[PDB]
């Protein structure tokens, strides 16, 4: 059972953007589908719902006449068409599954799509090593100057998770984001083990692997 979302990124104010959610692992045509959004640091806000057959749709008043929800039960997809977007629409958008019992509740959620309302252009990041030097050592990767959020960082293709800290991005004065991802490792492991940071910035389709050495 899985819901996979897509379509995030930058959108200028007043312009349009389309979100999509693909289902797999369950009888999709038997479930109603919600969209829920979450502004940075804020709570969950319901946006829209569509019935299993697609005959009924409902909308939050703030998006009425602005958003349109639809589904295709042959392609197992739900879509959220978002028009004349506003700064208040900048948020993480989830699609979520539901079934009539009364709507039971959202028991399966998509991983979310980040929508940023801005006139700023999309830029891919550059990745610089945070080299370990002089029992526990620290190393990392500096992910600098990208737009919009988010970027994801893993280490050694996900084989290294313990002691990993990926910091929330900060907005620089240039209007670009930057973050760091660090890992603590035994100092005796330096020059003996390979450490590679894997950086992904889907909006700019930028994929970077950076080996970090002493």
């Amino acid at each position: 059972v899985q819901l996979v979302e897509s379509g995030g990124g930058v959108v200028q104010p007043g312009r349009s953007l389309r979100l999509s959610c693909a289902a797999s692992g369950f009888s999709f045509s038997h479930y109603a589908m919600h969209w829920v959004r979450q502004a940075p640091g804020k709570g969950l806000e319901w946006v829209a719902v569509i019935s299993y057959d697609g005959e009924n749709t409902y909308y939050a008043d703030s998006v009425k006449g602005r958003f349109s929800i639809s589904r295709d039960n042959s392609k197992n997809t739900v879509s959220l068409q978002m028009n004349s977007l506003r700064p208040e629409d900048t948020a993480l958008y989830y699609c979520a599954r539901d079934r009539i019992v009364y709507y039971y509740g959202m028991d399966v959620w998509g991983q979310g799509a980040t929508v940023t309302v801005s006139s700023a252009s999309t830029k891919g990041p550059s990745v610089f090593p945070l080299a370990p030097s002089s029992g526990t050592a620290a190393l990392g990767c500096l992910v600098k100057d990208y737009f919009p959020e988010p970027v994801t960082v893993s280490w050694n293709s996900g084989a290294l998770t313990s002691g990993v800290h990926t910091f929330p991005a900060v907005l620089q004065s240039s209007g670009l984001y930057s973050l760091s991802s660090v890992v603590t490792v035994p100092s005796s492991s330096l020059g003996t083990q390979t450490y590679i940071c894997n950086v992904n910035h889907k909006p700019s389709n930028t994929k970077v692997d950076k080996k970090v050495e002493p």
Partner: protein, 213 residues
């Protein structure tokens, strides 16, 4: 709509504690209430439905009570991974579907001093004409900490930014990064770069430094 009010707004509790949070509906919703848990950086998870019925797979330490307009969620044995935000949600009426404002949960643990590391800018970055110096404060508690930069013993202002992680779901600590950004010309104009750290777990301020080159 049906307004959902949650209390408290946030709380701090110890591992193993019995903690209770409250949800209140603006009108009678019988037992048509869901509870969700959202861990830091994760999607919301449905904990229970019909006010008191646990979803399959949900840990037994979670229990819900109440009917009409007043509800509670209780955790009988708080675990490090129970941090994050809890939301109630009514399904007595739609549209609109409404969530409560959420209750934030933090773990109170023993004081832990930060491990401090300093990273000089990479040669690769210097090629671009910018230098980023990074100071790392790792696995400390509580969240409060101060970081100050010193360049040739000169106190720096307005040229650094900080980022702090959410509380760790395993050891309940925080980590912090401070990044000093300078032009290449300014960076090579000075020799000694230091970041000074103050924290409850430290008897004296800790300073880490390096010399350019």
């Amino acid at each position: 709509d049906i307004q959902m009010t949650q209390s408290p707004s946030s709380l701090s509790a110890s591992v193993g504690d019995r903690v209770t949070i409250t949800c209140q509906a603006s009108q009678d919703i019988k037992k048509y209430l869901n509870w969700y848990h959202q861990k830091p950086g994760k999607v919301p998870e449905l904990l229970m439905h019909d006010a008191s019925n646990l979803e399959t797979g949900v840990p037994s330490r979670f229990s819900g009570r109440g009917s009409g307009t007043d509800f509670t969620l209780t955790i009988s044995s708080l675990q490090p991974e129970d941090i994050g935000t809890y939301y109630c949600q009514q399904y007595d009426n739609l549209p609109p579907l409404t969530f409560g404002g959420g209750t934030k949960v933090e773990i109170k643990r023993t004081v832990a001093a930060p491990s401090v590391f300093i990273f000089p800018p990479s040669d690769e970055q210097l090629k671009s004409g910018t230098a980023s110096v990074v100071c790392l404060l790792n696995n400390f508690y509580p969240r409060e900490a101060k970081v100050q930069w010193k360049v040739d013993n000169a106190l720096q202002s307005g040229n650094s930014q900080e980022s702090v992680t959410e509380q760790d779901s395993k050891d309940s600590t925080y980590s912090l990064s401070s990044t000093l950004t300078l032009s290449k010309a300014d960076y090579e104009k000075h020799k000694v770069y230091a970041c000074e750290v103050t924290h409850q777990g430290l008897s004296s301020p800790v300073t880490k430094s390096f010399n350019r080159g």
